[PDB]
């Protein structure tokens, strides 16, 4: 026997019920008839809530609807006018479906329960964003919200987003609707470093926002602009800036399209149901029931999971809040005042359309993105070198072997020439020097150096009471924020990691030891094991070498011998061994091998133990060091490294000597 | 001249068709300069559309400017279907018994509606009085999507935040009654949680599923207890008995006060701030009630009535609200379930401050708690299953049983003798099995196997073997301190970057590992092309490996160390070695896992070093470890 199921619907006019009723005979026709048949019901949109409530309550759920299918009118009064029938539906667990409601705020399955839909929310736009931002390398961005539950779920979906990554907060910005003056945000808006933006609002908003933004000029070159289809359309189109990104959801103005697909799902859903037993019809007609409709929530349950990824308006897959998965969207570009197809989204993947990218003002490509940065140094003769600048002028025209000028930079340092010490004026130029000048390039940043008054890096010493002083050295003055960022051959260890953020490594080397080649087992070394006041084993106190012996347990007996006989600083320790002062040297091998190359009268012996990495150093608060790390990685894997290295370790005159 | 006020109220239930009608209204508190005009009118059975179309019908031409509702229902939805009908009016409402009073979404502020239930948050708060009195300290709460969440999350963080006592919040649960469960997916989340006291939040019909569950799980019995807001009590009247006994919860009471004591106090809320509006602006409040046609004008110049309303005090009592429309602090009653149905009184709280009767006891070793089951695999030497003689029936000696599904076989060993001495000296039993699943921990894209899962999903509390120790693993669970020396390793018949690239040299070299292995996966961390490459060279088991090895057809194999070298000593013929002087990089020791920072922890750690420190793994060495080879030495 056939079993007349029925569904029920609110369509903008009687040409869409007609449509609706075709998609259902299309829907009976294609699947078994002998079993089940659907049946469609529909009515127009009402003038208010409480008609359409009525007639859900009397025209549909009479009809023993399974479900509903609903649409934005033709004249939007207010915003979700397809509000009654989720709460009214609701109450019985019986699914809605809505065809044109974009709406945000139905995503949330407290409220609405019943609540699916064949479009994604506002806020799910972000997903387009996040990846633009992505693909575009821009991290830092400003968010622009409306105060309502739309923005800030924008808000949260975005943070969200972001929150996979270290979370991104460059900054945000709230502002309350209805509100024509908004001048004052924007002027804190500029202050913030992050030069792109992104906004969600009503077209009345940001036809305010558009205006107050143009005052300020931010609509200009070196800014971007993300927005939400609502913005590019609509009044807000009249008043909206030059080179501005957008999006365009598609099919979101048809019903039609949604409305054959929605149904084709539904039967599917249905079909699929069906097979499943204990099930019940919904509950005939509102008078007389007051209890809900055990099966809705399951219907819901398979709806949701019910593929047939075939679909006239595309691939059909539902998140968890009954919101539509894997939406397309078509991006937009205002160019000559117009809207463009610059490219169209689909799928996770953004595609480019073969038309010219534009940027806010004049760009034939312009992506650009996101104020001094205070550096300090140590004197560490391979990746740092010290020369005065000559009288007034600043610095020589001095060449590397491969032929290039050698870059030059001016730091402040100590000076031991004169007998008391200033802080002296210098030239320094250096293999880090280098690679911060190509970040400063790379990165927004502007560059003042100066070497740190204390020739030791850094060291944890001073006075006993609670916690007292700090670590003497370039370090110290990085907490104490003398310098913002620290630029030198710094080792990288966790005694010191837990007090600041540390870049990745540039460079990897361990320690090891000098010896004369001309007539040391290993890390471990009999002849150390097996120490002599005959036969002495030099280093630097407070060298970081030092913390290694102090620190560490294991070895801890072994740190004495090094201990007695320490030299101040490395070119002194490099001569003790050259001026044969001292048998043997040990220091990390990066600042050792091209000594050992410079000389040659000199090796390096053993494997480089104690393994390890230098890197720049930054404050865990600062998120200029994200950038850096991310930079640096940028730096090593086309061999800008491999190459720097290639030209500051000469290697010229060498070899193992045995 | 005369300002007579036009009102109507209405009654559903009351388990009468001839309800009590009119029996209030009757001039009180005349005073008031509005005098009140009722019409009141009773239905029998809530419905969206029978409430809608009535409530409007009364509208009419009459032009009533406010309405009380009250019910027999436990229904949770009527206060927001009644609140739906204001935001389209601008007519206030408000109700005093049932689902009306029960709580409801957020109201939107542009629309009035109130209740005479008791606020979220208050009610939250009422709970933790509750729980502080018989000093609970230690909770975990259940709710579901129901609307109001996460109001109460919240309030019950802001009032647990403050207090100086050392509470914990064990676990928050967030499920959707919506996509109903197959799964009985609260089955298997409510079955984690380990906390005796547990506060619940849902609908009334909900609470009796995640009831029915939660007898299925066990956790209604024997010391946990329960604790519940107003909304799963409802009216009281009637409790399927699905709730387990000794349920707590919260709601108003009937006796203190009749229902039309109630319906007074909420005309004379409405009249009295009908009478203050009157006194600010002179004005007349009233307004044409029809909703089918656009709202009345100057309806919209109403909003200031909301806030007049929001406090209101007549009979020496303050009916004062919330921005969201419950009144601030309504008297509320503790309530608990007496034994079979009855639902009987045991605390009085009002304002501030809550006074409760009960005194005490409110409706297995002294040093030490409960028991850990161990789960480990089998490696030689350390980890050694055996299959025990069937003649005997059970294990012999040294060896423990352990079991594997799939029978059980008998366990011995390093692993074995370490466990064996550390339970005789920290003094606890335990029950030991073999892995199934992946045996030493791996991982496939997102999620985690082995051992390591059975100590993630707490079905193991400490697990057992040749376990290596990485960062990772270190991260999830703490580890104990390593016994032995070892770490990565080769072994070969007899940093260079010979292993970096085989094709520099222009024969083929060949070295594999085991797949699986923490030294694999350290191995893809560091060196990709060396993984990538030696996936070719990958071998199934450490015997077959070794079979590799040992016939030819592969030069050198890389291991664990401790492995390596018991097998270095250990050979049919001493065709078998280490590298160099098999000093290891990735210098590691097998640690044990524990669960998290809770755990006997640091008392294991001592047991540990107290075993090298009267030598007995020295012994322990020469016997399990040493190898005959090496022999020349």
Not at chain 2, 343 to 353: A, L, Q, T
Request: aromatic share 10%.
């Amino acid at each position: 026997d056939p079993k007349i199921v029925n569904i029920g619907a609110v369509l903008s006019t009687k040409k869409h019920e007609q449509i609706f009723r075709e998609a259902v005979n299309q829907a009976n026709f294609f699947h078994f008839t002998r079993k089940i048949q659907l049946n469609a019901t529909s009515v127009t949109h009402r003038p208010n809530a409480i008609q359409m409530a009525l007639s859900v309550c009397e025209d549909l759920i009479s009809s023993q609807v399974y479900a509903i299918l609903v649409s934005h009118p033709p004249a939007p009064t207010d915003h979700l006018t397809p509000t009654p029938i989720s709460y009214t539906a609701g109450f019985y667990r019986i699914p809605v479906i809505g065809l044109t409601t974009r709406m945000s705020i139905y995503s949330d399955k407290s409220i609405h329960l019943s609540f699916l839909r064949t479009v994604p929310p506002y806020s799910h736009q972000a997903l387009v964003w996040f990846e633009m931002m992505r693909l575009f390398n821009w991290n830092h961005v400003i968010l622009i919200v409306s105060d309502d539950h739309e923005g800030r779920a924008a808000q949260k979906k975005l943070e969200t987003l972001l929150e996979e990554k270290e979370s991104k907060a460059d900054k945000v910005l709230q502002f309350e609707p209805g509100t024509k003056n908004l001048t004052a945000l924007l002027l804190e808006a500029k202050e913030l470093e992050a030069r792109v933006i992104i906004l969600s609002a009503s077209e009345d908003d940001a036809t305010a926002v558009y205006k107050s933004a143009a005052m300020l000029d931010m609509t200009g070159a070196g800014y971007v602009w993300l927005v939400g289809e609502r913005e590019i359309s609509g009044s807000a189109l009249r008043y909206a800036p030059d080179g501005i990104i957008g999006l365009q959801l598609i099919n979101g103005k048809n019903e039609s399209a949604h409305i054959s697909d929605a149904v084709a799902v539904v039967a599917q859903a249905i079909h699929e149901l069906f097979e499943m037993e204990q099930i019940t019809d919904p509950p005939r007609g509102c008078v007389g029931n007051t209890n809900i409709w055990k099966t809705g929530p399951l219907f819901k349950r398979v709806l949701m999971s019910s593929k047939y990824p075939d679909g006239v308006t595309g691939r059909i897959e539902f998140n968890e809040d009954g919101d539509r998965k894997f939406a397309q969207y078509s991006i937009m570009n205002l160019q000559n005042r117009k809207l463009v197809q610059v490219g169209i989204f689909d799928g996770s993947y953004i595609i480019q359309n073969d038309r010219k990218i534009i940027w806010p003002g004049g760009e034939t490509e312009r992506p650009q993105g996101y104020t001094r940065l205070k550096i300090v140094t140590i004197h560490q003769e391979p990746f740092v070198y010290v020369r005065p600048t000559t009288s007034d002028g600043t610095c020589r025209e001095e060449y590397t072997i491969n032929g290039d000028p050698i870059k030059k930079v001016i730091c402040n340092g100590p000076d031991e020439t004169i007998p008391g010490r200033p802080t002296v004026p210098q030239c320094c130029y250096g293999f880090c020097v280098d690679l911060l000048i190509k970040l400063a390039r790379e990165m927004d940043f502007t560059y003042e150096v100066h070497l740190v008054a204390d020739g030791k890096f850094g060291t944890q010493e001073r006075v006993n009471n609670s916690n007292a002083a700090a670590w003497n050295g370039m370090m110290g003055e990085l907490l104490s924020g003398q310098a913002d960022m620290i630029v030198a051959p710094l080792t990288i260890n966790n005694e010191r990691a837990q007090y600041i953020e540390f870049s990745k490594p540039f460079k990897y080397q361990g320690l090891t030891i000098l010896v004369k080649k001309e007539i040391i087992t290993g890390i471990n070394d009999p002849r150390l094991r097996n120490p002599s006041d005959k036969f002495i084993y030099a280093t630097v106190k407070q060298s970081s070498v030092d913390i290694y012996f102090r620190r560490q347990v294991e070895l801890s007996t072994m740190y004495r011998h090094m201990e007695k006989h320490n030299y101040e600083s490395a070119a002194e320790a490099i001569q003790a061994v050259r001026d044969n002062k001292l048998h043997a040297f040990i220091w990390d091998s990066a600042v050792l091998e091209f000594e050992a190359s410079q000389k040659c009268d000199l090796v390096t012996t053993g494997e480089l133990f104690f393994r390890s990495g230098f890197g720049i150093g930054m404050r865990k608060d600062s998120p200029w060091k994200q950038e850096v790390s991310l930079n640096i990685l940028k730096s090593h894997e086309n061999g800008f490294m491999e190459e720097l290295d290639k030209t500051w370790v000469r290697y010229q005159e060498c070899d193992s000597r045995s | 001249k005369h300002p007579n006020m036009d009102i109507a109220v209405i009654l559903v239930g009351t388990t009468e068709e001839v309800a009590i009608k009119d029996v209030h209204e009757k001039d009180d508190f005349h005073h008031l300069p509005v005098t009140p005009r009722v019409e009141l009118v009773t239905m029998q059975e809530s419905d969206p559309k029978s409430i809608i179309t009535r409530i409007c019908d009364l509208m009419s031409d009459k032009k009533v400017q406010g309405v009380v509702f009250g019910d027999d229902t436990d229904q949770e939805a009527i206060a927001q279907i009644l609140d739906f009908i204001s935001v389209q009016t601008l007519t206030p409402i408000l109700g005093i018994h049932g689902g009306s009073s029960m709580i409801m979404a957020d109201k939107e502020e542009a629309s009035m509606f109130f209740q005479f239930g008791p606020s979220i948050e208050q009610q939250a708060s009422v709970m933790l009085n509750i729980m502080e009195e018989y000093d609970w300290y230690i909770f975990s709460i259940v709710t579901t999507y129901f609307p109001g969440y996460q109001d109460f999350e919240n309030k019950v963080r802001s009032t647990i935040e403050n207090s100086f006592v050392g509470w914990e919040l064990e676990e928050v649960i967030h499920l959707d009654m919506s996509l109903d469960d197959i799964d009985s997916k609260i089955q298997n989340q409510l079955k984690k949680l380990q906390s005796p006291v547990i506060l619940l939040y849902c609908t009334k019909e909900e609470a009796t599923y995640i009831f029915e569950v939660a007898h299925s799980v066990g956790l209604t019995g024997y010391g946990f207890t329960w604790i519940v807001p107003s909304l799963v009590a409802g009216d009281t009247d009637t409790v399927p008995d699905e709730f387990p006994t000794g349920l707590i919860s919260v709601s108003y009471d009937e006796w203190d006060y009749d229902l039309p004591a109630r319906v007074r106090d909420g005309i004379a809320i409405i009249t009295t701030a009908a009478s203050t509006m009157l006194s600010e602006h002179n004005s007349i409040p009233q307004s044409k009630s029809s909703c089918n046609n656009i709202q009345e004008s100057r309806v919209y110049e109403a909003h200031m009535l909301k806030r007049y309303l929001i406090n209101v005090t007549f009979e020496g009592r303050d009916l004062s609200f919330s921005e969201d429309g419950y009144q601030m602090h309504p008297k509320l009653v503790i309530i608990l379930l007496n034994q079979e149905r009855k639902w009987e009184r045991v605390g009085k709280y009002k304002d501030r401050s809550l006074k409760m009767w009960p005194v005490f006891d409110l409706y297995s070793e002294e040093h030490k708690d409960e028991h850990l089951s161990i789960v480990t695999l089998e490696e030689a030497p350390f980890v050694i299953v055996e299959d025990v003689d069937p003649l005997s029936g059970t294990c012999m000696r040294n060896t423990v049983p352990c079991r594997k599904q799939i029978i059980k076989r008998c366990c011995k060993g390093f692993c074995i003798d370490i466990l064996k001495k550390i339970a005789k000296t920290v003094k606890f039993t335990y029950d030991l099995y073999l892995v199934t699943n992946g045996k030493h921990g791996k991982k496939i894209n997102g999620v985690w196997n082995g051992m390591i899962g059975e100590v993630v999903t707490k079905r193991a509390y400490m697990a057992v073997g040749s376990l290596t120790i990485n960062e990772e693993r270190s991260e999830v669970v703490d580890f104990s301190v390593p016994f032995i020396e070892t770490g990565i390793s080769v072994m070969v018949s007899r940093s260079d970057k010979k292993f970096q690239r085989p094709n520099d040299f222009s024969p083929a070299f060949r070295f594999g590992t085991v797949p699986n292995g923490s030294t694999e996966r350290n191995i893809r961390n560091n060196y990709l092309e060396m993984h990538s490459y030696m996936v070719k060279f990958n071998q199934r088991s450490v015997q077959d490996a070794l079979l590799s090895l040992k016939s030819g057809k592969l030069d050198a194999f890389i291991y664990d160390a401790a492995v390596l070298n018991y097998m270095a000593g250990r050979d049919e013929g001493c065709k078998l070695v280490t590298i160099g002087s098999g000093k290891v990089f990735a210098t590691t020791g097998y640690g044990i896992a524990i669960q998290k920072d809770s755990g006997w922890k640091r008392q294991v750690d001592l047991a540990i070093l107290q075993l090298f420190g009267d030598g007995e793994m020295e012994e322990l060495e020469a016997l399990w470890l040493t190898g005959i080879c090496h022999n020349e030495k």
